[PDB]
């Protein structure tokens, strides 16, 4: 009676809207904030980890999938782990058969065809998780937002999560010092992009910030609670 578009990944709203796989995009707007970016040489990923408990590992976000194609989940976590067991397993399958590194574009395209099937058929929710995958193939280190609407983006310097639009509007007006700006001064430039999604009072502490580095002549490397402490600078007071 009220909203007959509730039995609803088969239906269309009468304007153009599919009415819940954009609402899965709402379901990754609700998730925790993160930011990835790329240089001319190596792409980085930075994530703040929410602590909705006593204290925790704060539901560790950025994930090892790969052999240099790393991801950054936001949204649901079990569905994210299902999607990275898929992405993980067939990335290792391309290690098995072709014996080359699987290129990042075909990776993100075929998961963009794997999360697209339940959007199509009946009674099956979309994979409500916004990946922020990043890896270094033969050319420059790509970075792909993909979405629960199965529509990935070959982006550079993207931020997704809770109030991540402010991190984008910092990061949009600071693209000029990309394609330079080596690792020591790059990840500072990403953390001061992350340090706007916080509620205006809080340090990027060593607890909640977990980052990942991938690129030329280095494996996708996870920096946890201890290893993020050499990345320290700013005020921003933000």
Partner 1 sequence: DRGVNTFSPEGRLFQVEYAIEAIKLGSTAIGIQTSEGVCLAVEKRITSPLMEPSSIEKIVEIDAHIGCAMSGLIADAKTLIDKARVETQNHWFTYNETMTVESVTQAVSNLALQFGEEDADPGAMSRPFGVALLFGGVDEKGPQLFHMDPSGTFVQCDARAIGSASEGAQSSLQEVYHKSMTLKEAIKSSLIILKQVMEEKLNATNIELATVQPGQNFHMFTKEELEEVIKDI
Partner 2 sequence: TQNPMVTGTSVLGVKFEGGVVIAADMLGSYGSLARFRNISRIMRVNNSTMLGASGDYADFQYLKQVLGQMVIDEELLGDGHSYSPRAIHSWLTRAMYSRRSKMNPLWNTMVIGGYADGESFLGYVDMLGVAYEAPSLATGYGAYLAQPLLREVLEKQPVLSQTEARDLVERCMRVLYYRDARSYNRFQIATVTEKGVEIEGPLSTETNWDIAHMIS
Partner 3 sequence: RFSPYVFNGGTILAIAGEDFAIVASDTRLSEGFSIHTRDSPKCYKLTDKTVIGCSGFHGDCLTLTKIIEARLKMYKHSNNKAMTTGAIAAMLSTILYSRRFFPYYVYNIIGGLDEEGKGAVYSFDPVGSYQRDSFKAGGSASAMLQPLLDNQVGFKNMQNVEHVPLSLDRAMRLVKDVFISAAERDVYTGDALRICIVTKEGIREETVSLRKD
Nearer Cβ to partner 1, position 62 or 214?
62
- Per CB under 8 A, contacts with partner 1 among 39-78 are 53-59, 76-78
Q: Rounded to an integer, what distance in angstroms lies between the CA atom of residue 78 and that of residue 58? A: 15
Among partner 1, partner 2, partner 3, none, what does residue 83 contact (CB within 5–8 Å per kind)?
A: none
Among 25, 46, 65, 150, contact with partner 3 (rule: CB under 8 A): 65
Cβ contact 198:48 at 8 Å: yes
Among partner 3, partner 2, partner 1, none, what does residue 89 contact (CB within 5–8 Å per kind)?
A: partner 3
Angle between helices 104-114 and 78-96 (to 10 degrees): 130
106 is a contact residue toward partner 2 (CB under 8 A): yes
Among 40, 50, 95, 238, contact with partner 3 (rule: CB under 8 A): 95
Among partner 2, partner 3, partner 1, none, what does residue 7 contact (CB within 5–8 Å per kind)?
A: partner 1
Chain breaks in the chain (C to N over 2.5 A) after: none
Residue 121, burial from CB neighbour count under 10 angstroms (0-12, 13-18, 19+)? exposed
Q: Provide the sign of the torsion angle of the four alpha carbons 63, 66, 68, 70, taken in this order.
A: negative
Torsional class of 233: left (φ above 0), alpha (ψ -120 to 50), beta (otherwise): beta
3-state secondary structure of 132: strand
225 is a contact residue toward partner 3 (CB under 8 A): no
88 is a contact residue toward partner 3 (CB under 8 A): yes
Stretch 90-129: interaction string toward partner 1, x if CB under 8 A: --------------------------------xxxx--x-
Cβ-based neighbour number of residue 141 at 10 Å: 23
Whole-number minimum distance, CB 27 to partner 3, in Å? Answer: 26
Whole-number minimum distance, CB 96 to partner 2, in Å? Answer: 7
Interface positions with partner 2 (CB under 8 A): 96-100, 103, 105-106, 109, 137-139
């Amino acid at each position: 009676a009220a909203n007959q578009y509730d039995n609803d990944v088969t239906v269309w709203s009468p304007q153009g809207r599919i009415h819940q796989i954009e609402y899965a995009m709402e379901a990754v707007k609700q998730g925790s904030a993160t930011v990835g970016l790329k240089s001319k040489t190596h792409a980085v990923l930075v994530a703040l980890k929410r602590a909705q408990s006593e204290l925790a590992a704060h539901q560790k976000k950025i994930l090892h999938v790969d052999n240099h194609i790393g991801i950054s989940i936001a949204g649901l976590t079990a569905d994210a782990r299902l999607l990275c067991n898929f992405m993980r397993q067939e990335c290792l399958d391309s290690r098995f058969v072709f014996d080359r590194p699987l290129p990042v574009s075909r990776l993100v395209s075929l998961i963009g065809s794997k999360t697209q099937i339940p959007t199509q058929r009946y009674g099956r929710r979309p994979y409500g998780v916004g990946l922020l995958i990043a890896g270094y193939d033969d050319m420059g280190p790509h970075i792909f937002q993909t979405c629960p609407s199965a529509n990935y983006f070959d982006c550079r310097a993207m931020s997704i999560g809770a109030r991540s639009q402010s991190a984008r509007t910092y990061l949009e007006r600071h693209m000029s010092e990309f394609m330079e700006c080596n690792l020591d001064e790059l990840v500072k430039h990403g953390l001061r992009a992350l340090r706007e999604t916080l509620p205006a009072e809080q340090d990027l502490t060593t607890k909640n910030v977990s980052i990942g580095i991938v690129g030329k002549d280095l494996e996708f490397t996870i920096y946890d609670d201890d290893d993020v402490s050499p990345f320290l600078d700013g005020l921003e007071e933000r």
